[PDB]
C-alpha cells in the first residue's frame, strides 16, 4: 500500500509512461502521487 497507493490504478507502459488513476477521485494522474 506504500509502494503503490491504495485506491489508485498502478500501471506502467514500456513506452515509458507511468500513470496512476484515482479510482476514488475519477481522475487521471501523470505525475507520481508519492512525490506529489
Amino acid at each position: 500500500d506504500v509502494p503503490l497507493p491504495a485506491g489508485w490504478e498502478m500501471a506502467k507502459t514500456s513506452s515509458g509512461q507511468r500513470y496512476f488513476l484515482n479510482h476514488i477521485d475519477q481522475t487521471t494522474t501523470w505525475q507520481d502521487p508519492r512525490k506529489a
Binding site: 490504478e9 500501471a11 507502459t13 509512461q17 500513470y19 488513476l21 475519477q26 481522475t27 487521471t28 501523470w30
Partner: peptide, 14 residues
C-alpha cells in the same frame, strides 16, 4: 509533453 493517458472508465490497458 505527454500523449493522452488511459481512459478512466474501467481499465487503462488490457
Amino acid at each position: 509533453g505527454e500523449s493522452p493517458p488511459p481512459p478512466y472508465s474501467r481499465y487503462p490497458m488490457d
